[PDB]
Design a protein around this nucleic acid. Structure first.
Lengths: 72, 158, 107, 67, 141, 53
RNA sequence: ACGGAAGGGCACCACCAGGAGUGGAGCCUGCGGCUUAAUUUGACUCAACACGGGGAAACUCACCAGGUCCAGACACAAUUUUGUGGGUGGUGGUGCAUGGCCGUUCUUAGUUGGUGGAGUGAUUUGUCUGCUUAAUUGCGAUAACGAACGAGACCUUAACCUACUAAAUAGUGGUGCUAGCAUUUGCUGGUUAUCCACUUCUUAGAGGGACUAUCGGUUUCAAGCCGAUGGAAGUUUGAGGCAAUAACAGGUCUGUGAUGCCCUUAGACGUUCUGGGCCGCACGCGCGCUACACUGACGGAGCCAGCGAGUCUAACCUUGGCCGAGAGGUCUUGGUAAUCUUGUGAAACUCCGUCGUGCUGGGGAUAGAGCAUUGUAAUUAUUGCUCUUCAACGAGGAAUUCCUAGUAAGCGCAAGUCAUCAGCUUGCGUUGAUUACGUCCCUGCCCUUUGUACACACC
């Protein structure tokens, strides 16, 4: 999330000054991350970081191929 | 504490810089040339060579009382590692800084315009320096400003 | 084992010649007086990580200046000596400033 | 810019007067022979006299020199 | 003790292992393709090493590499030219001789930094000077 | 005998003055030096001298 | 030296050729003025005005509030106690009672003797009639001969070695099984003296490349032009550094007690102290940008660059967790750190559903309410955050700056200045593209001739 809010940052003006890149919100990022943690898609992995749970792994491999073969 | 990884190992320049400027702006009458330090293993010995060995010996204590105690009271070495005994050493007068001390003495003793001149050129000849170039700013008379100069033997410029 | 050979890499690092000649003459005379294997050292392209505290704020005028440069003469020894004498080289000739990286690697 | 100087000639005339049967046409035989005929204390002088040996074999295959 | 060597091999700006996996034109390594990228900028630039040279031209060559080093921009701007050299030059054992001769003669008048592999290597610079194009940073007095 | 010659001096430009010559520059606290610009030139051998570039 | 005389040769701080602009709402900078006790001072041309760290919140703040305060050694009328010549009080002061350091002559090459002679001296030959440029660079003849310096005298450069019996932070086969599919072995921890060796990228020391050569003419080849261009280099090897010759009433006497200098210690030539102005504007000058679009927006990959500090007696201290609309607030984690805030991650780029060009979406140097940070200190808003009508220009005249491979130019980050206060400089990135290869027409700069009543030398 420390890089997610950065990558979602944007340009802001300090009046008669140039535009500076500034980080995005952290509150909503933490809240949606916790929401999906409670739902059980994302999961906190060892050594620092998040991994994908088995519902998301099943959504990744087979049904993605099925959905794209349907809509293509 | 007084320890850092790769900061003081490079910032140590200021110490011997202060040492060098102090030796230049105070240790001038002795003819301070350079510290021929030789740290032998199993016997840490820090010596000094002088072109006026009679003067750095002196009356046995007036210079030594400061010279042996100030180099130790500052950093608190154990005794017997920064030792001050001066001996007869060769090739003391074979350097540009030695010619600089010689012409300093020849300028300070107060000879006339030609006597110091042929004296210094005979001395640099007998030392074997085949060329010199010197400039003196300021003045001899009481006027605005002057810059005298003479160069014997042609040098690359610069 | 008894009389272990783990070969902690002794990292010869000096700044001045008075200490460089001191430690190099020390280790080679030690090898000479207790008859170590005849394998001597050579220098290196020194391990310079660029760090310094510059004090040149603003760029006006022309350059009548020097170069900020310094050589930490980090050298090494290509030999097969015991870890015992590798440790005793650090024990004797006490001068704070010589670093020894704990590295279990002989060659 | 693409002009020559007397600094190469003062060595060139001497080395050919010394070693007429030397100066084979090839660049490395010129260079690795001249560097040990004449001591050089500069890598840029080494590269420049390499180039000048190329100029020299060009002048030799041009033919007789005026002097 | 044992003469165990790691088969060190060279690449554009990184290391490699010298054990190639032969195949039947499978441009992948067993769990992931690379070529499906869809950048929306460099599409014709990546089609240039292949579309002008021959459409498939992979019936007798695969790329089997895993290296961590160099850079991503160097990777995108190097691997395509690398396999271009592999398919135009290393294929001299396989491709038609007159075809590759025609190709080299066609590219002699095309060497305009489009068929040049990135031979860049990282290099450190020394502390004391920073300028590249503008002037340095010095004070008066 | 004076009571009012003290004054708060702990931080800021009013507390710390130069030590070089009662100089008028050098607001640089690098390694506690606070040394002047003419003073950096009075310093002899701290530049790391060598000339090729 | 000059020439408003002639010839020859160069410069995108000169342009038939144009592009990016200032001068337009505007300020950060000093001037002169009103100035309050002060709004402290230096300098006036391509050679100051974003310069003197000068982007100043209580001694570099020099100005007052003034009851400031007696705090020197040495004859004195009976804490030298009012007064003495002056211990320093110069911290009142000039580049003009002194040097030193930088700049100008250095967008263009010129400099010096010793011999030989000529000038019955100043001086001249050497230092050049032509012929080519980044050059006194090569041919060539000569009162010429043989010698150093500016380039040549040196090294860092830019896409460099199957290379160095060099190091566990940058990694590769076999892999220690697979936790993503676990049968389609690359991998997830390299099972915390951790699957071993080492550099093949973190640390760079050597010798080595490219030279107009193999072609022909453009000089008689003795210079030099082309294209097959040959790549660690066809522009000398792109960009960088030697202040060479000898001078400047040039910035530094207020820079370190640096100069034959005017005066004092009780009313100190004010050392210090309660604080605050040092950003006040009727005015113009100068480098720096926020817009004058369907180019304003959601969603995402767009992230490929070394840059810099750390208690050692006071503030650098979390990558991650948690609360918040957000300044922000607390913990294994960082004082000897390639090691921890640092595993530095530099930014808007194409897209379609929709609103949507207008003085309205194009924005905020303008004014108001609340949320808190660094600093005793946020007063004459230091600063970021939630909201509120936008005045501001329809691309700004006369005049004036930069511009030919990492091509100017639009854009954002790293470092110095920083406790907090960038529009100030260097390096990178995204696109990496011109309108130019000739000129002396304006501007200046070097060589030759010529005249001069100038030589503190056309002010």
């Amino acid at each position: 999330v420390g890089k997610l809010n950065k990558l979602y940052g944007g340009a802001k003006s300090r009046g008669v000054r140039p535009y500076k890149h500034i980080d995005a919100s952290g509150s909503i990022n933490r809240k949606v991350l916790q929401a999906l943690e409670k739902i059980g898609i994302v999961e906190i992995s060892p050594k620092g970081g998040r991994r994908i749970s088995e519902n998301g792994q099943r959504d990744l491999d087979r049904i993605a191929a099925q959905t794209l073969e349907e809509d293509e | 504490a007084l320890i850092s990884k790769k900061r003081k190992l490079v910032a140590d320049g200021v110490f011997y810089a202060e040492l060098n400027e102090f030796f230049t702006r105070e240790l001038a009458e002795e003819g301070y040339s350079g510290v021929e330090v030789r740290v032998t293993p199993t016997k840490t010995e820090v010596i000094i060579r002088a072109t006026r060995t009679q003067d750095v010996l002196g009356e046995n204590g007036r210079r030594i009382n400061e010279l042996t105690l100030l180099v130790q009271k500052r950093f608190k070495y154990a005794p017997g590692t920064i030792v001050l005994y001066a001996e007869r050493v060769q090739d003391r007068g074979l350097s540009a800084v030695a010619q600089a001390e010689s012409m300093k003495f020849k300028l300070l003793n107060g000879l006339a315009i030609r006597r110091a001149a042929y004296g210094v050129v005979r001395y640099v000849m007998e030392s074997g320096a085949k060329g010199c170039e010197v400039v003196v700013s300021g003045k001899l008379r009481a006027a605005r400003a002057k810059a005298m100069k003479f160069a014997d033997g042609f040098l690359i410029h610069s | 084992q008894q009389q272990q050979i783990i070969k902690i890499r002794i990292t010869l690092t000096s700044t001045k010649v008075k200490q460089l000649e001191n430690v190099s003459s020390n280790i080679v005379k030690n090898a000479e007086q207790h008859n170590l294997v005849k394998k001597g050292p050579v220098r290196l392209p020194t391990k310079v990580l660029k760090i310094s505290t510059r004090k040149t704020p603003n760029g006006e005028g022309s350059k009548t200046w020097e170069t900020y440069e310094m050589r930490i003469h980090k050298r090494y020894i290509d030999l097969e000596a015991p870890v015992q004498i590798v440790k005793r080289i650090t024990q004797i000739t006490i001068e704070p400033g010589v670093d020894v990286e704990v590295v279990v690697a002989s060659n | 810019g693409r002009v020559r100087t007397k600094t190469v000639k003062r060595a060139s005339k001497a080395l050919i007067e010394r070693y007429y049967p030397k100066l084979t046409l090839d660049f490395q035989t010129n260079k690795r022979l001249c560097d040990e005929i004449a001591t050089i204390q500069s890598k840029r002088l080494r590269n420049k006299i390499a180039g000048y040996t190329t100029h020299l074999m060009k002048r030799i295959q041009k033919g007789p020199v005026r002097g | 003790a044992v003469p165990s060597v790691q088969t060190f091999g060279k690449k554009k700006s990184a290391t490699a292992v010298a054990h190639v996996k032969a195949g039947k034109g499978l441009i992948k390594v067993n769990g992931s393709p690379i070529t499906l990228v869809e950048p929306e900028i460099l599409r014709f630039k990546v089609y240039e090493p292949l579309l002008l040279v021959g459409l498939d031209k992979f019936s007798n060559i695969d790329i089997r590499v895993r290296v961590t080093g160099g850079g991503h921009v160097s990777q995108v701007y190097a691997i395509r030219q690398a396999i271009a050299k592999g398919l135009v030059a290393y294929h001299q054992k396989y491709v038609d001789e007159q075809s590759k001769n025609e190709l080299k003669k066609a590219f002699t008048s095309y060497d305009r930094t489009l068929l040049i592999a990135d031979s860049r290597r990282p290099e450190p610079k020394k502390f004391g000077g920073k300028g590249a194009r503008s002037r340095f940073q010095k004070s008066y007095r | 005998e004076n009571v009012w010659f003290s004054h708060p001096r702990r931080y800021g430009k009013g507390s710390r003055q130069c030590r070089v010559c009662s100089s008028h520059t050098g607001l640089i606290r690098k390694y506690g030096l606070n040394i002047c610009r003419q003073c950096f030139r009075e310093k002899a051998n701290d530049i790391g001298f060598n000339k090729f570039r």
